Design a binder for this molecule. Sequence first.
Ligand SMILES: CCCCCCCCCCCCCCCCCC(=O)OC[C@H](COP(=O)([O-])OCC(O)COP(=O)([O-])OC[C@@H](COC(=O)CCCCCCCCCCCCCCCCC)OC(=O)CCCCCCCCCCCCCCCCC)OC(=O)CCCCCCCCCCCCCCCCC
Ligand SMILES: CCCCCCCCCCCCCCCCCC(=O)OC[C@H](COP(=O)([O-])OCC[N+](C)(C)C)OC(=O)CCCCCCCCCCCCCCCCC
Lengths: 80, 71
Amino acid sequence: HIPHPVKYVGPRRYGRYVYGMNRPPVLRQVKDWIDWTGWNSVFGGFSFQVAFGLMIVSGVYLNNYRATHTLYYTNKPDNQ
Amino acid sequence: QVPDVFATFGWERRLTVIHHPGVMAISKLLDQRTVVKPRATFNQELVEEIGDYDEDLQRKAQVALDNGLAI
Ligand SMILES: CCCCCCCCCCCCCCCCCC(=O)OC[C@H](COP(=O)([O-])OCC(O)COP(=O)([O-])OC[C@@H](COC(=O)CCCCCCCCCCCCCCCCC)OC(=O)CCCCCCCCCCCCCCCCC)OC(=O)CCCCCCCCCCCCCCCCC
Ligand SMILES: CCCCCCCCCCCCCCCCCC(=O)OC[C@H](COP(=O)([O-])OCC[N+](C)(C)C)OC(=O)CCCCCCCCCCCCCCCCC
């Protein structure tokens, strides 16, 4: 490996929990958590499903909608 | 004049080296955990962090820090 520094630049401590006072917004806390535990796991874990989902759902336009207007021999109506 | 001594470690598998008689005496003395005691010295930065885990210890640690006590 290559020795590198800890990349976490967020707040190292929020202070003692006192009935949830003087704490960051929820979304800020979620972001700090993922920063603290690493985004590499998030990207790695979600990558497989994102890829599969994007490909399957992309067929809604690439395979279904487009195709409806793809066949060049379909727009022509008979007896017209 | 300080003579050299053999210092051995391990019970069944024993490793022998040469060592200083005074350094070995200190080593065994520090093994007397009931006699020789580790003591903590605080600073204001670390005392504040203690409160995040034990509020009572923070107050007591602050007293020790204010008096410069190794406790
Ligand atoms: C205005 C806009 C208009 C529209 C424009 C549209 C443009 C296109 C949009 C689409 C996007 C294009 C993007 C192109 C560039 C992408 C560049 C990029 O970022 O890619 C990299 C990105 C991530 O790669 P990376 O950067 O290497 O990852 C970084 C990591 O963080 C690095 O960290 P790491 O490696 O340390 O990561 C963590 C790692 C750490 O791991 C390790 O430490 C290694 C461990 C290895 C051994 C593992 C042991 C075995 C596993 C044990 C655990 C098992 C648990 C699960 C058990 C399951 C039991 C059933 O852990 C893992 O990854 C593996 C373990 C986690 C669990 C694994 C679960 C199983 C996986 C295998 C199966 C996957 C398939 C599942 C299918 C479903 C289920 C059957 O990959 C992708 O995004 C995928 C490819 C994307 C390009 C192709 C897309 C094609 C389709 C596009 C269609 C789009 C729509 C088009 C519409 C058109 C209309 C006109
Ligand atoms: C709908 C069907 C499914 C239903 C079931 C779903 C099961 C999964 C639920 C997971 C919940 C995990 C809870 C963890 C415990 C949190 C405890 C707590 O209060 O923590 C406070 C703590 C307080 O912070 P702290 O005090 O720990 O701070 C640590 C110290 N510093 C500041 C240095 C970082 O903060 C958090 O909440 C941290 C945890 C955040 C975790 C967020 C995980 C999200 C999981 C859902 C993923 C959704 C993905 C959607 C698609 C995304 C696409 C890219």
